[PDB]
Design a protein around this ligand. Structure first.
Ligand SMILES: Cc1cc2n[nH]c(=O)n2c2cc(-c3ccncc3)ccc12
Length: 259
């Protein structure tokens, strides 16, 4: 394999595009220099070897080589879902809905084999050539159920505007509804083209305005009542009152045929 261009850097390293010379196959390569991490990078591989789904970025292999680690990962040639949300516009409601469905199938599968991605946001929803959505990056993901026994979480991980309010208050919390919340901030982004708030916290006027049901404001006013009816159920402060993926699957707007 040989490295063509540089797809998305940041911290852990870079995903670079790599095309093989002879075979006519291109598939991305995360590059991690452990000088910082060795016990973390083996957790992402652990968790990647578990995964196999049409809505999750496939894993292929890895080669440790000195301080360097290479994670060979399915190439998603449609880029990020971040780059298809237009500022203060968002996207066509029928495209929003199609992506939510494929997003609920990826997380329904994760949750079923006891993984939680923990940092779901548009940057981490890649897309293939036929524009099917894939869940990407499991280096913050973790095992919230093993041998049919659930472990509540307590560590603060994620990105502040997608994170669930209980992750800043409660000292321990279930992993599933934190993924359900993130997926609802992603639904507001796809239909509103802005993120509602910095963080779901209490000295934050925007979140306090949502809890007061001031939907006559941004971003909620750019969203139609059907899919705003559903967001009302996902972005609930109390995790045990919050909706679940089987009850999203029966939502009016989730099963509404959109043009
Ligand atoms: C950050 C990241 C991880 C990744 N894993 N697998 C992939 O395809 N990517 C990425 C692919 C792109 C991309 C960029 C331009 N055109 C198509 C795809 C960008 C970032 C990533």
């Amino acid at each position: 394999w040989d490295l063509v261009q540089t797809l998305g850097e940041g911290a852990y390293g870079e995903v670079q595009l790599a095309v093989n010379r002879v075979t006519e196959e291109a598939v991305a390569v995360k590059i991690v220099d452990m000088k910082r991490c060795p016990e973390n990078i083996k957790k992402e591989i652990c968790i990647n070897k578990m995964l196999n789904h049409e809505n999750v970025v496939k894993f292929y292999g890895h080669r440790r080589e000195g301080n360097i680690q290479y994670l060979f990962l399915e190439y998603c040639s449609g880029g990020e879902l971040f780059d298809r949300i237009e500022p203060d516009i968002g996207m066509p409601e029928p495209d929003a809905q199609r992506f939510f469905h494929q997003l609920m199938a990826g997380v329904v599968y994760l949750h079923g084999i006891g993984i939680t991605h923990r940092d779901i946001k548009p940057e981490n929803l890649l897309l293939d050539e036929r524009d099917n959505l894939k869940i990407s990056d499991f280096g913050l993901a973790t095992v919230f159920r093993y041998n049919n026994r659930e472990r509540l979480l307590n560590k603060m991980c994620g990105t502040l505007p997608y994170v669930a309010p209980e992750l800043l208050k409660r000292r321990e919390f279930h992993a599933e509804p934190v993924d359900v919340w993130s997926c609802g901030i992603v639904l507001t982004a796809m239909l509103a083209g802005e993120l509602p708030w910095d963080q779901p916290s209490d000295s934050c006027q925007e979140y306090s305005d949502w809890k007061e049901k001031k939907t006559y404001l941004n971003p909620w006013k750019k969203i139609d009542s059907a899919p705003l009816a559903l967001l009302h159920k996902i972005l609930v402060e109390n995790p045990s009152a919050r909706i679940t993926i089987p009850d999203i699957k029966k939502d009016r707007w989730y099963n509404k045929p959109l043009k």
